[PDB]
Amino acid sequence: EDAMTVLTPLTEKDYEGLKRVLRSLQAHKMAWPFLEPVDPNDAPDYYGVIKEPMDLATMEERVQRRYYEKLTEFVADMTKIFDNCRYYNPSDSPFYQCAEVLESFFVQKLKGFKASRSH
Ligand SMILES: Cn1ncc(Nc2ccc3c(c2)CNCC3)c(Cl)c1=O
């Protein structure tokens, strides 16, 4: 990651962009498995093996509460959603495929955010 992503404190202006990114993910057709926490009754041993669960509703609360101090922390929470999903699920799972497409979409939106920060 670039130094600005690691080191530059997030401003209120930055948080308008973070909310835009999050809303774009929540609206994506393939974000449906990630909107709310994994239901334990759908996924045996999930909370036994996934030590740091994450979901977009939890990130929405953190964005609202100004939890993130650096962009790298926001990216880390987002990356947890996808990494957890690919850890638990087989590569032919619909969940795994959602993580693959949504992560690519996140990286596109993230690159746009970082550039808007530079100007
Ligand atoms: C193993 N597993 N199972 C499920 C799941 N997402 C999911 C799927 C459906 C629903 C919710 C979450 C929450 N709200 C209810 C419906 C992931 Cl992302 C996963 O990895």
From Swiss-Prot:
Expression by tissue: Ubiquitously expressed, with highest levels in testis. Present in kidney, liver and brain. In the brain, highest levels are found in motor cortex (at protein level).
Family assignment from sequence similarity: Belongs to the PBTF family.
Illness: Neurodevelopmental disorder with dysmorphic facies and distal limb anomalies: An autosomal dominant neurodevelopmental disorder characterized by variable degrees of developmental delay, intellectual disability, speech delay, postnatal microcephaly, dysmorphic features, and mild abnormalities of the hands and feet.
Job of this protein: Regulatory subunit of the ATP-dependent NURF-1 and NURF-5 ISWI chromatin remodeling complexes, which form ordered nucleosome arrays on chromatin and facilitate access to DNA during DNA-templated processes such as DNA replication, transcription, and repair. The NURF-1 ISWI chromatin remodeling complex has a lower ATP hydrolysis rate than the NURF-5 ISWI chromatin remodeling complex. Within the NURF-1 ISWI chromatin-remodeling complex, binds to the promoters of En1 and En2 to positively regulate their expression and promote brain development.
Lineage: Eukaryota, Metazoa, Chordata, Craniata, Vertebrata
PTM summary: Phosphorylation enhances DNA-binding.
Assembly and oligomerization: Interacts with MAZ. Interacts with KEAP1. Component of the NURF-1 ISWI chromatin remodeling complex (also called the nucleosome-remodeling factor (NURF) complex) at least composed of SMARCA1 (isoform 2), BPTF, RBBP4 and RBBP7. Within the complex interacts with isoform 2 of SMARCA1. Component of the BPFT-SMARCA1 complex at least composed of SMARCA1 (isoform 1), BPFT, RBBP4 and RBBP7; the complex is catalytically inactive and does not remodel chromatin. Within the complex interacts with isoform 1 of SMARCA1.
Parent-protein residues present: 2919 to 3037 of 3046
Protein name: Nucleosome-remodeling factor subunit BPTF
Cellular localization per UniProt: Cytoplasm; Nucleus
Domain notes: The second PHD-type zinc finger mediates binding to histone H3K4Me3.
Residue intervals of the Bromo domain: 9-113
